[PDB]
């Protein structure tokens, strides 16, 4: 049957970003207090809070060097709504202060939460896939996220995926195949091969980073620095381990609930590897990844 991929919120009727006063966020974080801290950060610290509306938010205090990550976020996630993208609700810009206020996502990031069975994990892979295809295939210019990872997948009340952290994000004209940057930005164990060779990002880069995050869901392990790995990231630990046995790489917890999903779990691993191809052009688009997951389920 025929799917329509993107039928999320019409933007014209959507709540605009609320420009928030500093004093407001200062009071609600109880003084940007350490106990109100959720996120010790690359680009800022993240404070849990409740506004004067009663609405739960997560506030990102961005660190002022002597405002690119602010503007990266305003120009991309601040312009768009989708069920699988975190809702940026408002912002604050005073003097040299740049704050970003998000809807608070009840179960925090996926990494922290890794308390969820297989049906719940595939719901996370698919929903996280869908949100990355939004960025690639349904925005123009395309959005290249440039930092996909477990801690950048948040989880709501119903445990659906919500792609997060757009501080790295970049707009790329639909007419272009790549975009040229200045530095190598990434999170260790997530960085695609060709980014080490060139200062260029692409949507195909995001596809690589995506697959790693699929392994995390398959195997239940961190992407780097776990006891079994030895020398390599889990891209290496999955790639070599295979010939020995494939089904051993899977998270015990999934396998333990049922011997019947042994096969449903293998095919999802075929998708993840395809994303992890060393030649960008051979990788599925986030839209092909979605069809891959849907074929599997019939």
């Amino acid at each position: 049957d025929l799917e329509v991929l993107f039928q999320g919120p019409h933007m014209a009727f959507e709540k605009p970003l609320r420009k928030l006063t500093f004093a407001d966020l200062l009071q609600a974080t109880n003084g940007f207090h350490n106990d109100s801290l959720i996120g010790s950060g690359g680009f800022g610290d993240v404070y849990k809070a409740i506004l004067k509306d009663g609405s739960a938010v997560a506030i990102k205090k961005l660190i002022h060097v002597s405002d690119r990550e602010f503007m990266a976020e305003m120009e991309t996630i601040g312009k768009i709504k989708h069920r699988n993208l975190v809702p940026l609700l408002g912002y604050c810009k005073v003097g040299d202060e740049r704050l970003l206020v998000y809807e608070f996502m009840k179960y925090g990031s996926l990494e922290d939460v890794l308390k969820l069975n297989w049906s719940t994990r595939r719901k996370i892979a698919i929903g996280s896939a869908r949100g990355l295809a939004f960025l690639h295939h349904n925005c123009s210019p395309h959005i290249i996220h440039r930092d996909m990872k477990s801690s950048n997948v948040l989880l709501d009340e119903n445990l659906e995926a919500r792609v997060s952290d757009f501080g790295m994000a970049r707009l790329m004209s639909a007419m272009d195949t790549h975009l040229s940057v200045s530095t190598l930005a990434g999170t260790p164990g997530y960085v695609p091969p060709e980014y080490y060779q060139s200062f260029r990002c692409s949507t195909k880069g995001d596809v690589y980073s995506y697959g790693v995050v699929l392994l995390e869901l398959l195997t239940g392990k961190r992407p780097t620095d776990s006891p079994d790995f030895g020398d390599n990231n889990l891209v290496g630990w999955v790639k070599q381990h295979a010939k020995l046995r494939i089904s051993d790489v899977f998270d015990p917890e999934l396998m333990k609930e049922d011997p019947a999903l042994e096969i449903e779990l293998l095919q999802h691993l075929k998708v993840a590897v395809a994303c992890l191809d060393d030649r960008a052009w051979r990788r599925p688009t986030m839209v092909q990844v979605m069809a891959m997951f849907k074929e599997i389920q019939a």
């Binding site: 295979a242 010939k243 096969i263 395809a274």
Partner: peptide, 15 residues
């Protein structure tokens, strides 16, 4: 690469 993906399909077929 080709090997790895082929290896995975071998496995799936078997099961």
């Amino acid at each position: 690469m080709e090997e790895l993906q082929a290896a995975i399909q071998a496995a799936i077929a078997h099961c």
